[PDB]
Write a protein that holds these residues in place. Structure first.
Motif, short mmCIF file in Angstrom:
data_model
loop_
_atom_site.label_atom_id
_atom_site.label_comp_id
_atom_site.label_asym_id
_atom_site.label_seq_id
_atom_site.Cartn_x
_atom_site.Cartn_y
_atom_site.Cartn_z
N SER A 163 -18.16 -10.55 -5.84
CA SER A 163 -16.79 -10.07 -5.74
C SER A 163 -15.84 -11.20 -6.08
O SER A 163 -16.22 -12.37 -6.07
CB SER A 163 -16.51 -9.57 -4.31
OG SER A 163 -16.68 -10.60 -3.36
N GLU B 238 -8.45 -10.41 -5.20
CA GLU B 238 -7.56 -9.43 -5.78
C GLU B 238 -6.45 -10.21 -6.48
O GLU B 238 -6.23 -11.38 -6.18
CB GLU B 238 -6.95 -8.54 -4.69
CG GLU B 238 -7.95 -7.66 -3.97
CD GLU B 238 -7.28 -6.74 -2.96
OE1 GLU B 238 -6.51 -7.25 -2.12
OE2 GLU B 238 -7.52 -5.51 -3.01
N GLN C 133 -8.22 -10.98 0.06
CA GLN C 133 -9.33 -10.04 0.07
C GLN C 133 -10.00 -9.96 -1.30
O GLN C 133 -9.35 -10.10 -2.33
CB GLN C 133 -8.85 -8.65 0.51
CG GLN C 133 -10.01 -7.68 0.74
CD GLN C 133 -9.63 -6.51 1.62
OE1 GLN C 133 -9.26 -6.69 2.79
NE2 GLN C 133 -9.71 -5.29 1.07
N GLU C 134 -11.31 -9.74 -1.30
CA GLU C 134 -12.06 -9.64 -2.54
C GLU C 134 -12.43 -8.19 -2.83
O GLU C 134 -12.21 -7.30 -2.01
CB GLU C 134 -13.32 -10.51 -2.47
CG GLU C 134 -13.09 -11.89 -1.88
CD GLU C 134 -13.87 -12.99 -2.59
OE1 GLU C 134 -15.02 -12.73 -3.03
OE2 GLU C 134 -13.35 -14.12 -2.71
N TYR C 135 -13.00 -7.95 -4.01
CA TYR C 135 -13.41 -6.61 -4.41
C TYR C 135 -14.48 -6.72 -5.49
O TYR C 135 -14.63 -7.76 -6.12
CB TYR C 135 -12.20 -5.84 -4.95
CG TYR C 135 -11.68 -6.34 -6.29
CD1 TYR C 135 -12.02 -5.69 -7.48
CD2 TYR C 135 -10.84 -7.46 -6.37
CE1 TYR C 135 -11.54 -6.14 -8.71
CE2 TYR C 135 -10.36 -7.92 -7.59
CZ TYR C 135 -10.71 -7.25 -8.76
OH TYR C 135 -10.25 -7.70 -9.97
N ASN D 158 -19.89 0.16 -12.29
CA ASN D 158 -19.63 -0.73 -11.16
C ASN D 158 -20.81 -1.69 -11.00
O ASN D 158 -20.89 -2.45 -10.04
CB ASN D 158 -19.44 0.08 -9.86
CG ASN D 158 -20.67 0.90 -9.47
OD1 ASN D 158 -21.71 0.86 -10.13
ND2 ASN D 158 -20.56 1.63 -8.37
#
Length: 765
Positions: free
Chosen positions: A36, A39, A74-76, A444
């Protein structure tokens, strides 16, 4: 059917993550543990790139007042979902040119009596229209393609590290000295800036915005319309110029700092550096972009070509090394004796005629080369050869040898490095790991990339390097005929797959016959053709040869199959009509002119468009101003500044011989050709034509990822060691430097070079 009905593409069986992963997994295709990234958060541009604050306060300020940076709390997990067209749901995306087909059938029927040679044009156009479909394929196609690439890189004929086969950085560089001669950047009284700054520093100002104007842009060429890449999915490079520059700057600054770390510190400096690389993993993950092509309908689900869309920063960083050099190296067979390169070749302006004369010459065996394409004349036979899925054969060290070559020949002044150790470390130990055997993003899923990512700033050079090595092995075997077991054995020696896509016997004879049998047409009598004039389908970078009685030379004609393939499926106020003029005139100009029905049909279909646009006041002339940018064939006419019109005059103008551009190189290439150097280098006794620069890079590649600064010092010492003739013997200075490196204990362990450390860090989760 005479006119095929619209085609409805089959349904895509792998249009979902669960299905895709299943397929990859059952084919032994590596799926990585997902990583990840932060953001994107809004930031004041002048705050991040204060040194470019001036660019926004002017007309043409591509810099937005703010930037989106991958530094949020925050990560994604990123996702990329390409839209495939056409599809079962929307099959009307890219229709066949049915209007052209009808027109041609009409012209044929109009011809009193009959002529099977004219009918063949409609037969061929028809066959293409029903066999092919233009579009971006499917997931099933991209995926099936991927396991094919893995198969080329693995299994049948596994890729091999050239360095473990007997080659050395300098060894491969002396082969490229001939195969891909290169010159220094700039090439003026006021050259280029050295590889020692961060990208934002490549933009210099003089006119105080209060004076007049004066900006110096030293940044590489970038396609603003192409995808930005992993950090910004859904965005174009043009929309992310600022962030692309900011991330490169930040990345290069941290790397520099980590390389200048002091010894005797709390914690290992090694882990600190490897962690920074892990945080930038996304710089090694390309988007698996489906390439829009005219594929075969029967292959819609099993074969879709992929473009490894490199992340902007990685692309910018690598281009700062390759482009300045490559864009100034118009060195090939037309302007350098013994040079087999076709690098910046263009068939027009007498280009093709020279290649034909090169073929006619009695000398043989001989070879021409362009990236993953190899052309060989042996026993009066012409062989068009292709590396099988070129890119998948690439190894991280192949690219490393390529970066070495580019730096030592393009960024060195008489052996003097024109780069700091930050860039040396990036070029030799980071860049190769970022775009070769790294990974890609589809849906994804973070998936493995086997070989080099087709699309990274160095895919051409890396492929050219690969072909160059097979030419070297070919020479050492005494140049066997391409159809022989001997020639094929080169595959197992280099771990590089290849195949003959085309063979033409008695080539000199057939080429001479073109002169004897040229038929009247635009370039033979200056008249509208009624019969196609013969050609020899060389497929020299897509071109065929035919003879012009009006100019007395051979001129190019686009390969027949490619010409009719394009005619069957065109690519992407009354703008529609204007584009049809470009489409039809371009098809003629590039080769349609030599085919009676096609020519007349495009001519008429184009004529109507001009008239329609006339009875509408459309400013067609201002529209076609830079038409090369509106055509799939524009690349061929870019630097010609010609009018989009097809007549005996214009075609004569297009092919009128022009003197070749002067070559730009350092040391005059061995006129003896590649086999002279091939036999020489095989001796094991060769000089270090890279000088100090070569030692610095070899040291940097053989040392620990963190010891780049020391690695250079050990090199500088070793160079001073032999004051008279330091560059006497490469193998000598090499064995020596390895001892020095181990004495200073900065020498990496056998199976744990800087490259491997970087690759593991990028993958680490």
């Amino acid at each position: 059917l005479l006119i095929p009905k619209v085609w409805v593409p089959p349904e895509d069986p792998l249009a979902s993550p669960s299905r895709l992963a299943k397929f990859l997994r059952e084919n032994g295709y590596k799926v990585l543990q997902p990583r990840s990234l932060p953001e994107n958060e809004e930031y004041e541009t002048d705050q991040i790139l204060p040194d470019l604050a001036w660019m926004r306060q002017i007309e043409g300020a591509v810099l937005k007042p703010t930037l989106s940076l991958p530094i949020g709390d925050q990560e994604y997990f990123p996702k990329y979902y390409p839209t495939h067209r056409p599809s079962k749901e929307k099959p009307n995306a890219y229709p066949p040119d049915i209007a052209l087909l009808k027109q041609m059938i009409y012209l044929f029927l109009q011809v009193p009596e009959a002529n099977e040679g004219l009918k063949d044009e409609v037969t061929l156009l028809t066959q293409n229209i029903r066999d092919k479909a233009y579009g971006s394929g499917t997931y099933m196609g991209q995926a099936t393609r991927l396991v094919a690439m893995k198969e080329v890189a693995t299994g049948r004929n596994p890729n091999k590290d050239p360095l473990k086969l007997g080659y050395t950085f300098e060894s491969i560089a002396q082969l490229l000295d001939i195969t891909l001669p290169v010159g220094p950047p700039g090439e003026d009284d006021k050259p280029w800036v050295p590889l020692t700054r961060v990208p934002s520093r490549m933009l210099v100002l003089t006119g105080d915005v209060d004076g007049d104007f004066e900006v110096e842009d030293y940044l590489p060429k970038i396609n603003l319309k192409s995808s930005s890449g992993l950090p910004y999915v859904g965005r174009t490079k043009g929309e992310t110029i600022g962030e692309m520059i900011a991330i490169s700057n930040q990345f290069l600054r941290e790397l520099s700092t980590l390389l200048k770390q002091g010894a005797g510190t709390k914690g290992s400096n090694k882990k600190k550096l490897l962690s920074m690389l892990s945080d930038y993993w996304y710089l090694s993950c390309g988007l698996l972009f489906p390439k829009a092509e005219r594929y075969d309908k029967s292959t819609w689900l099993t074969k879709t070509r992929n473009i490894w869309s490199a992340p902007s920063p990685t692309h910018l960083m690598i281009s700062m090394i390759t482009w300045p050099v490559m864009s100034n190296s118009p060195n090939n067979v037309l302007n350098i004796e013994g040079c087999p390169s076709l690098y910046k070749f263009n068939p027009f302006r007498g280009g093709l005629n020279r290649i034909v004369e090169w073929i006619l010459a009695p000398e043989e065996p001989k070879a021409l080369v362009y990236a993953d394409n190899i052309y060989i004349v042996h026993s009066n036979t012409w062989y068009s050869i292709d590396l099988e899925k070129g890119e998948a054969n690439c190894t991280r060290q192949h690219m490393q040898a390529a970066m070495y070559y580019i730096l030592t020949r393009g960024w060195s002044d008489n052996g003097d490095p024109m780069f700091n150790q930050t860039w040396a470390t990036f070029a030799m130990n980071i860049a190769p790991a970022l775009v070769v055997d790294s990974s890609c993003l589809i849906m994804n899923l973070q998936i493995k990339t086997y070989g080099q990512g087709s699309g990274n700033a160095a895919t051409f050079i890396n492929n050219h390097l690969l072909s160059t090595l097979v030419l070297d092995q070919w020479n050492l075997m005494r140049q066997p005929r391409p159809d022989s077991e001997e020639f094929k054995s080169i595959e197992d020696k280099l771990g590089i797959n290849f195949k003959i896509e085309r063979s033409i016997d008695d080539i000199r004879g057939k080429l001479r016959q073109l002169v004897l049998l040229a038929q009247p047409g635009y370039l033979s009598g200056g008249v509208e053709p009624e019969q196609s004039s013969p050609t020899v389908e060389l497929d020299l970078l897509g071109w065929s040869a035919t003879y012009s009685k009006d100019l007395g030379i051979y001129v190019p004609v686009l390969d027949k199959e490619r010409l009719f393939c394009s005619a069957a499926y065109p690519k992407g106020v009354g703008i529609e009509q204007a584009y049809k003029v470009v489409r039809y005139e371009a098809l003629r100009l590039v080769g349609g002119w030599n085919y009676p029905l096609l020519n007349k049909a495009c001519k008429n279909n184009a004529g109507a468009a001009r008239r329609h646009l006339e009875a509408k006041g459309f400013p067609l002339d201002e529209f076609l101003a830079e038409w090369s940018e509106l055509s799939e064939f524009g690349e061929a006419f870019e630097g010609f500044n010609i009018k989009l019109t097809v007549t005996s005059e214009s075609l004569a103008e297009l092919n009128k011989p022009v003197p070749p551009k002067p070559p730009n190189v350092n040391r005059p290439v061995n006129t003896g050709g590649l086999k002279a150097v091939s036999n020489a280098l095989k001796t094991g006794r060769y000089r270090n034509e890279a000088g100090l620069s070569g030692l610095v890079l070899l040291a940097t590649a053989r040392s620990r990822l963190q010891d780049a600064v020391k690695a250079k010092a050990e090199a500088e010492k070793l160079h001073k060691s032999k004051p008279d003739d330091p560059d006497a013997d490469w193998f000598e200075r090499s064995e020596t430097l390895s001892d020095l490196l181990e004495k200073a204990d900065i020498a990496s362990k056998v199976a744990h070079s800087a490259l491997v450390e970087t690759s593991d860090a990028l993958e680490a989760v």
